[PDB]
């Protein structure tokens, strides 16, 4: 098991791809998944050792390219929307 | 002048109350925010 790091995964045949973290989501004794208003798999519980892992989408973001008009420069400053600056 | 000030000062006050004691003043704003979100979920559910 790996944490805080985007991975593919399968749990118990539940699959998906996410960022598995440590979560206080108190799952029920017999409850397997979690889910969410949008009906999208969220928390899971590690089948072997029983614990509440979040999930989290990967990143997305657009990529916006800030530029002063090419008439002025050739220098652009990319903007990665909506990420924390690492995965760059 | 004095009177008006009071009328106005008072008048302001009620607004707080009109707003505090009521969720149905802001329906409009409150609605837009729904219909959007309302329309997302729909969009999402379509995935399933």
């Amino acid at each position: 098991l790996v944490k805080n790091k985007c991975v593919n995964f399968n749990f118990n045949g539940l699959t998906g791809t996410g960022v598995l973290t440590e979560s206080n989501k108190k799952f029920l004794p017999f409850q397997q998944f979690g889910r969410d208003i949008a009906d999208t798999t969220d928390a899971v519980r590690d089948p072997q050792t029983l614990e509440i892992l979040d999930i989290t989408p990967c990143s997305f973001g657009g990529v916006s390219v800030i530029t002063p008009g090419t008439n002025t420069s050739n220098q652009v400053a990319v903007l990665y929307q909506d990420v924390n600056c690492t995965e760059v | 002048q004095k009177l008006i000030a009071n009328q106005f000062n008072s008048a302001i006050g009620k607004i707080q109350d009109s707003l505090s004691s009521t969720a149905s003043a802001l329906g409009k704003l409150q609605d837009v925010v729904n219909q959007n979100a309302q329309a997302l979920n729909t969009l999402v559910k379509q995935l399933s």
């Binding site: 999208t40 657009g62 | 003043a25 802001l26 925010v33 999402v44």
Partner: peptide, 27 residues
């Protein structure tokens, strides 16, 4: 701002929510 009201709940499928140019602090 109280009388009115998940943000990333609908962000699972490319459905992003670009922040407004003007920020509720500027407004």
């Amino acid at each position: 701002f109280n009388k009115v009201t998940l943000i990333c709940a609908q962000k699972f499928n490319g459905l992003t929510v670009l922040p407004p140019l003007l920020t509720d602090e500027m407004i």
